[PDB]
Amino acid sequence: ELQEKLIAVNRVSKTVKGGRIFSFTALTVVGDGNGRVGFGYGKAREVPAAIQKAMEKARRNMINVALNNGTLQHPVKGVHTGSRVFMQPASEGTGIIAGGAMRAVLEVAGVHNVLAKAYGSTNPINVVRATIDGLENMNSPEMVAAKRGKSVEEILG
Amino acid sequence: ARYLGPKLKLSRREGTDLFLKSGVRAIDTKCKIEQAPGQHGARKPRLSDYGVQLREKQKVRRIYGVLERQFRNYYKEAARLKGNTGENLLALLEGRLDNVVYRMGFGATRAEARQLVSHKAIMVNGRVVNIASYQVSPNDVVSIREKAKKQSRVKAALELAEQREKPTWLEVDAGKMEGTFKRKPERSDLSADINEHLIVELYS
Amino acid sequence: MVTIRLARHGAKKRPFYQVVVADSRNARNGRFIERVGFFNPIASEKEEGTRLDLDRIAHWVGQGATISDRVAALIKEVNKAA
Amino acid sequence: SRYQHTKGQIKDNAIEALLHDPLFRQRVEKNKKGKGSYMRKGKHGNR
Amino acid sequence: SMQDPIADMLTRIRNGQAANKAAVTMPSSKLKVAIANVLKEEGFIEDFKVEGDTKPELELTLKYFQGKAVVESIQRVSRPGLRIYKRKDELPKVMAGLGIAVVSTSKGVMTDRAARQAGLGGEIICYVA
């Protein structure tokens, strides 16, 4: 039921006199593929354990975002740290145009068609966070109506 | 314009029943489709995302028997066309005369169908075409010439077609050896194993 | 001088003509004043082949425009068809 | 096949001169495990 | 210098939205008033009122629906440094329609959508979401 995927893995070192501990950072992301997305960032001495940790993290602290049928609702900019991301709604069946890491990120989310680009410098974790921020910002056609206290059709045209 | 040599190697590399042979005999009994090509068969490394897309693309190319440049051209054409891009790409891929013939049941394999098309046997609209990449329009009647009606391989192909899956967008006749194109090929009729989106993403 | 002349504006083995009004001395396939139609030398029996705007041609000759022999012949056949 | 004598116009001893130029350098092993050993990315990389 | 009044107003509005202010007071203009009216019509704000004879002050009442600010992003595209003029068909659609653009239309200042409906272009003042 839940789509789950590893994005990035780092060899991260806690240097000590007794010898530098070579530890593994794991970055995963889960989601049902219908709306909700949740990223998880787990680090451990081992790799599979780390990945499991990451998965667990992803499992809770999950962001619920509504989707325009099977695509993005509105041209949204998701910003985090140094990695600024522009994300655009794309036409029917054109595919997830996003990245090597970001494509995977959006795959779990459930967006079929997207036109997305990260700018400047892009760390995987950072980029995922940016995406998530963008998603959070992203609002449904009825939410905006509610905010306005208005009709959806009227808002549309 | 075409690959020549070991053809089930391709699908072994993929790891899926790709229908790259006629298949009266089972695909697992004749070749070890479960295993990768060569020495490093039992080895199954963790495959990259780009890598998987590439593999999918290759699978698609294998399916039809289309080399890279031609495939690129097809993709471009699809992009040019209105609507679902992947679907459009699928449509003309199918629309290839040889592939249409294969679907009908006049060549038991896609390569075989291509060969038949080449060897002056397939006669669309009363004109025999050497070219396999002829895009077939709806409401077109393709006939097999009386010179080609002597062959038993065609009969075998027909039998295989009868045995296997039946397409809805095409009508095939056994004793008459006539085909009819009803509508443009769609994603609904074809199997869900194809990942057109991935290929599209790759071609950027 | 002003001439109603046809130019071979087609490919190798697949020829195509276009009946234009142009200066005589200048290049055949280069520049023109006004195009009035076209001509298919293959001339398929199923669907047309030859197409011109006769009124414009008539107007041009009224104000003194020469007609090429082939063009004249084509015009004559069009008239016959009519 | 020439070697471009870093020393140049060699006047006295050729052997000694050569031994005192890049061709006969002090070459040091980049060993693993110990001191001057750590590599961020290996020969084949992390999987 | 007090160069752009509209921009200043927009900034004030943004600040209010951020700091959860119920009412924002600012120096007033006729065009400003029109803009405010347009905004009200669109549904972003509660009510606007201008008061002052020698020194006119526009008061704007803001909405915070379900514990969050309604006017999320509000930014000028046309500027005193660089003015952007758009044609009828060249008019933008801000956030796929779910969001609007303030346009200086020759038949009264209004929404981009409204301008499109009319068949008239002009200067695209601000982008409101």
Add this chain to the structure above:
Amino acid sequence: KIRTLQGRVVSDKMEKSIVVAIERFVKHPIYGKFIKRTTKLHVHDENNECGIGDVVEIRECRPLSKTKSWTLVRVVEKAV
């Protein structure tokens, strides 16, 4: 109706000859800023009636000299 153009006098030192500048509003193709752009022209004037720094209405006409190709129709501002 024929085209008319308006500008201000740069100098009127030369005998029966005026230099007028049109401060045209140019839209920049790259950036989008509207620049007041100088269009410095040599204009023919009758009787040398105008003065230095004066707004005049001019029309497009035949070449009179090497650079001259305008004649004024009416003077819009006279006061200095």
Add this chain to the structure above:
Amino acid sequence: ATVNQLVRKPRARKVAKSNVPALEACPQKRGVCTRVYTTTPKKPNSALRKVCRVRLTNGFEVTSYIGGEGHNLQEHSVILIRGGRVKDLPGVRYHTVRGALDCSGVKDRKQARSKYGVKRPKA
């Protein structure tokens, strides 16, 4: 970033300079070997590298790497230049495309022979 600034002096684009100045925007070039020699590479490495100072078509005395093992290259011989740079040697921005002109291909190489001018054998 100010538009007015841009207006009166525009964006001075980063001047694209060629990595291979002696080539003069040409795929290959012909040169007679003024000197044929071998010299040590950069400090991460330790070897002896096949190189040639060549007097060029346009009179441009440049050093060029000689790819492959075992060469017929001698002083006063006409060679052809690839514009491929080698980070091991300073000044070396050129390969010598083997199998061309006076020079011949590398002996007994079987795979990746298209770069070293070795012929198709009967095996």
Add this chain to the structure above:
RNA sequence: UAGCUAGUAGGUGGGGUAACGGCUCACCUAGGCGACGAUCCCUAGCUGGUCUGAGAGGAUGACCAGCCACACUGGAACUG
């Protein structure tokens, strides 16, 4: 590359151009151009376009289309 230029810029009259004209001569005036880059130098066919690019743009301008220029270099006029 910060000053450029005396037929130089404009007038009046003459000579001429197919025709307007410093296009040219006589004479007077002291101008005109320019940091919205005149001037000087280096490179360059320009353009319709072509490639690239999401788009904007960036590069480039073989072919095909048009204009110009040049015919050994330099000129120069006769003819039509």
Add this chain to the structure above:
RNA sequence: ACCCGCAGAAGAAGCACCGGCUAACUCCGUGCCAGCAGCCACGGUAAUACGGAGGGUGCAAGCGUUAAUCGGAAUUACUGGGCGUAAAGCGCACGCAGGCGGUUUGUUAAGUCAGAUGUGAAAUCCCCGGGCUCAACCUGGGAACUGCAUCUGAUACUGGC
């Protein structure tokens, strides 16, 4: 051109690559030597990186290569960067040219926008079909040709009075 008859796979496949990027990995000399390489440097006696052999991968009558140009470079950022510490605030003020300009009314229509006219040679690029046996190609229509100009208007703004 194209079409009819004949035999037979007969005469038409190979280069580039397989360390990671970058799809694909093992064994034999070799040993910081020879060599590799677009970059991070492989090579120091077990090389998934050299060189060969076997097994691949991807192209395909090619394929590399260097070159050239654009992209990715949001590495000149109009779109779409910045500037405390990373490169980047004139040492600081006054100040003309220019750039930017508060509010109310009238009002020009300059600017701009709208609309209409002329129009933007063609071919192509682009859309629908058409002819080739389909493609490349030729082209028919249509669209575009983002313009430039005239006139008729619009008065919300920008500037001018």
